[PDB]
């Protein structure tokens, strides 16, 4: 606890990327009908026959999904940037992609080009994939050890705030209209121009400068400013230790992450935690929501979702104030457990949907409580924890692997779930309850507490476990 404006500024400017990721994730839902009308008109205006609903659904599905494909590629490409350019400059450099993607999506209507929309979603996907790796890596290396998890939770906060804002902007009376939806999608350009202006005044990680570039006194002076104290000897020395370790060790690529015994457990934890986020059922809960919301008298679908967005935000903040006290294990487990209870309730309330006339209110309650438990742990923790499971040398390759598995599992779930729901119906949530319980067991037996521990302490403990 040594928090000056500089540290806040640096972390806040970095979480613009988190906001960007959240915004582009949530922005696409509301304007579906409007964009399909655009796609139809683009073909009709040629004088051609109007497209079938099958073709529209097809093009629309590609628009949505190609974003994930971009993210898979970008998140796995994180390793190409962070050691070569640094952590701060990597973020500055890739804003080219955010500007590019936003231009395509923003100009696709006036250019009357469905192809530009699809292309824009791919490029903004690439950008967001790089962000999901760059931001926690930067925050992790620049935060005081006692606040590493708290600050790391600001990544997820930026993401959920980004989602909320995109949804609100998606309202018909704001930017969600026939004449304003290019502005809706094009909006992502503005935070990029703001971030690029602000970033050069954010310092590079002192850890990176000292450990990777051997610039000790440069790191110290920066460390003194960020933590607002002249005595930073304990931290500077701990960085010297990590630096000595890295120059005595072979620097790991992706493939060797899996050949080294002392890396196997950390990397397996990292991947599994990414899965515990995307296979939680969090992507199934809303698939049903939009239709459950009608039955309960909402008759206002985006409004039902925005409300969930507020709950989404509140419990991310709750997680922020808990993660340094309760620890990562406890918050992850509690969240997994509460989601297990809610998904089970979802199955029951849906199975009794029309034998009893109150069940739609029950399902909504289950959905909101589900969202709350998701953000307690499984939402924010898996993003910043892999940065904690590794020291300086293998972190970049580890975050490329972890991040990719997160984006990939998200993509596969979205591909496979509609089928599963079609064959299992209400029982599909029981499958997630099984996943959630299994993940809960994994965390309880296999995931060490990382709260307040130095990277060196954590790594040595993994080395000790590997020696027997
Ligand atoms: C298809 O549009 C959307 O997914 C928006 C869904 N509604 C957002 C919403 C509103 C209210 C409450 C909770 C939520 N959610 N829901 C999921 C969700 C979430 N995750 C789960 C999925 N993820 C993700 C989504 C993508 F697209 C592409 C790539 C992704 O990771 C690589 C990242 C973290 N985090 C916070 N709130 C969330
Ligand atoms: C209908 C309205 C049309 C007019 C609209 C005018 C907007 C002008 C541009 C604003 C740039 C947006 C910047 C987004 C700020 C990102 C928030 C953030 O950085 O997150 C804070 C915290 O770190 C999270 O954890
Ligand atoms: C009717 C009897 C009254 C009981 C009704 C209960 C209803 C379901 C409650 C779910 C809350 C979720 C709790 C999460 C459980 C996970 C356990 C956990 O988090 O363990 C932490 C660990 O001990 C740290 O080291």
Author numbering: 4 to 471
Task: Show me the paper's own sentences about this structure.
The major facilitator superfamily (MFS) glucose transporters (GLUTs), encoded by the SLC2 genes, mediate the transmembrane movement of various hexoses and derivatives in different tissues. Exposure of the substrate-binding site to either side of the membrane is achieved through rocker-switch rotation of the two domains as well as local conformational changes exemplified by the bending of TM722. The ligands that specifically bind to the outward- or inward-facing conformers of a transporter, wherein the substrate binding pocket is accessible to the extracellular or intracellular milieu, respectively, are defined as the exofacial or endofacial inhibitors.
To elucidate the mode of action (MOA) of SA47, we determined the crystal structure of SA47-bound WT GLUT3 (GLUT3-SA47) complex at 2.3 Å resolution. The tail stretches towards the extracellular side in Conformer 1 and bends to be parallel with the membrane plane in Conformer 2. The pyrazolopyrimidine moiety is stably bound via polar interactions with Gln159 on TM5, Asn315 on TM8, and Glu378 on TM8 and π-π stacking with Phe377 (bottom). While the benzyl group of the pyrazoloaryl tail forms a π-π stacking with Phe289 on TM7b, the two conformers of the aryl tail are coordinated differently by GLUT3 residues.
